[PDB]
């Protein structure tokens with residue numbers, strides 16, 4: 224499906240991403256690289272304002288353009304937030320502004336650190352002929368020390384990658400539908416569910432690598448989309464495609480409704496690469512797997528469909544426990560409306576659960 228920029232092995236994630244910019248952008252790299260210390264000390268802001276307005280042109284191809292969105296990305300948040308206690312003032316200088324606001328409008332992304340940046344493009348396997356495991360993976364850019372931004376980015380990543388096993392049968396699904404192949408479609412739906420259960424195991428690792436109290440107080444403030452004030456020019460899991468992909472594959476209508484829950488999810492598409500946005504919709508353009516599976520009156524097909532929905536609902540429900548442990552509890556011990564959030568996340572679990580057909 225490579226015109227949508229999906230990869231057999233590594234899903235929506237950018238495969239084997241650039242980790243060296245050109246030389247002309249050695250200025251940029253050596254802020255971003257040594258960024259735990261520039262924030263800690265305070266000589267980050269210093270060093271950004273004491274810089275020049277580099278052109279984006281020398282960035283040739285995609286992989287290189289995207290690394291640039293990352294480097295500029297971590298720099299922007301770190302600059303604007305600072306140490307993340309009071310200093311959060313003062314809009315970016317036009318040194319970093321125009322590149323980011325140029326390169327963002329080029330790659331059709333927002334001028335802001337997104338999932339596509341800080342997870343998808345933000346990794347490398349250390350020993351190039353070793354497997355996609357936690358040992359043999361590391362991120363390109365952290366923010367502080369003990370922000371657990373390695374564990375976080377990489378567990379996030381490894382889920383995209385488990386999902387990649389399911390995503391890659393989806394043509395087999397739509398193929399076997401139009402060509403009236405019950406047996407083919409049936410296996411294809413058990414494959415998906417059997418992979419989406421695999422996706423939950425990877426998810427368990429979050430406990431192991433990401434520290435609860437660390438994440439809340441330290442790291443999340445730099446991924447907080449539009450907290451603060453941009454003040455530049457004319458005006459992060461859950462920006463993931465993985466969940467909305469299979470929302471749509473299984474004809475589960477989240478974004479259909481007159482509700483906040485729904486519109487939030489459809490807005491999240493604007494934080495995705497354009498190619499993924501494109502992909503998602505293509506799925507919607509296709510005949511409904513849900514409606515098809517219903518018409519046939521085939522007990523074993525509903526079973527294999529209900530298995531994919533089970534699998535999703537499973538993921539969503541676990542996701543909540545993770546939020547309890549990594550937001551709610553930590554959020555308490557931190558000297559009104561509060562958590563409508565858990566409403567939101569349930570409202571979406573709920574809606575997925577409703578799409579079961581016994």
Ligand code: HEM
Pocket residue numbers: 378379382383429433438460461462463465466467539542545546549550564568571572
């Ligand atoms: C410490 C780890 C995580 C925490 C604390 C967390 C927290 C949250 C929260 C609070 C939301 C609601 C909107 C918001 O972000 O403000 C959210 C939404 C979401 N998160 Fe996460 N998340 C985590 C990891 C993940 C991972 C690894 C994935 C996928 C690989 C994921 C997938 C989603 C999705 C798809 C949504 C949109 C709502 C939905 O589809 O149900 N999250 N997350």
Ligand SMILES: C[C@@H](C(=O)Nc1ccc(Cl)cc1)[C@H]1CC[C@H](c2ccnc3ccc(F)cc32)CC1
Pocket residue numbers: 443446447448449450459460550
């Ligand atoms: C930052 C917020 C926001 O403000 N939105 C917003 C949307 C539109 C507009 Cl116009 C303004 C703001 C919104 C919620 C806080 C952030 C957040 C919270 C809790 N857990 C997280 C876990 C991982 C992660 F990556 C981010 C997490 C994410 C983005």
